[PDB]
Design a protein around this ligand. Structure first.
Ligand code: HEM
Ligand code: HEM
Lengths: 145, 145
């Protein structure tokens, strides 16, 4: 359940999440777009869910894609800010899940974001240790889907 | 259309928005909830859109309402962060409007948030000068609805 998954965010996992976000969250626009383009490149099958975005291969030049990518980063900002309080983290994660559940995005589908996150981390000198910390955060959302 | 509304965000308006947000955005949970509860108190009819939240009379204690309130503040955080780049502000505002348009929330209905905002600002001692600034930011969103 989401409550059991939130309990997996141990002291050091939270610390690694903050230290890495300090860098990644510094450029929401650039890293947000990189994340999305990587998702569409490594998992072309997910492009179907983003029909409204138009030609996703335009990247930064696509206004809708840029708007979505920036916004996506503020959801992560939200999660990071709620790390101190499990109760708040959970209610924010369930809230976040509503629209994704409506879109029929399953836990397995959502989990495909892990690859893109790991690659963006690596591009900024953050290794497996951090990719795994983020996989744990993503797992909290998966538990809500 | 949204670009024209964004044009009303002058240097002075952006300055007042950033200064007031520095305080209001420092307690997203507290002010976020204050904003929704005030909305429901002053315009009870708006509750019709939030049936999913359940017993909104519980206020802060209501996990779903708390979750929504905290999340609402990150949309404003997003807007405030894009103030110096009209192109990014616009794409973020249009991305934001999509779900609200789907909910059939008109510009007139959305404008009901102005009262609650003015009251929340006043509770932190930010006068009319600041309320007007915020009314202008809301107007940018209204232009997208
Ligand atoms: C780190 C993971 C992710 C984050 C933080 C994230 C964040 C967001 C946010 C903030 C929104 C806007 C609010 C909403 O409509 O719910 C959104 C929309 C959306 N998300 Fe997610 N999302 C993530 C991963 C995914 C994945 C993996 C998929 C699908 C495979 C997905 C599909 C969608 C779709 C289709 C939209 C609507 C886009 C549009 O039409 O503008 N999301 N997401
Ligand atoms: C400054 C004003 C507002 C901000 C920043 C704001 C922000 C948000 C955000 C970030 C979401 C989550 C993403 C989404 O589903 O679109 C949302 C959801 C929602 N908003 Fe807005 N909103 C505002 C005003 C309003 C108003 C005035 C109404 C209606 C009278 C409205 C009705 C809704 C509803 C019904 C939801 C879904 C709630 C749920 O079931 O969880 N919003 N809004």
């Amino acid at each position: 359940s989401v409550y059991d998954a939130a309990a997996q965010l141990t002291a050091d996992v939270k610390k690694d999440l903050r230290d890495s976000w300090k860098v990644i969250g510094s450029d929401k626009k650039g890293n947000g777009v990189a994340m999305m383009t990587t998702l569409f490149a490594d998992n072309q099958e997910t492009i179907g869910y983003f029909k409204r975005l138009g030609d996703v291969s335009q990247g930064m030049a696509n206004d809708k894609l840029r708007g979505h990518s920036i916004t996506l980063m503020y959801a992560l900002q939200n999660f990071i800010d709620q790390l101190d309080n499990p109760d708040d983290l959970v209610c924010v994660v369930e809230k976040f899940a509503v629209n994704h559940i409506t879109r029929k995005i399953s836990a397995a589908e959502f989990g495909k974001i892990n690859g893109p996150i790991k690659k963006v981390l690596a591009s900024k000198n953050f290794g497996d240790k951090y990719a795994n910390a983020w996989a744990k955060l993503v797992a909290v959302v998966q538990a809500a889907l």
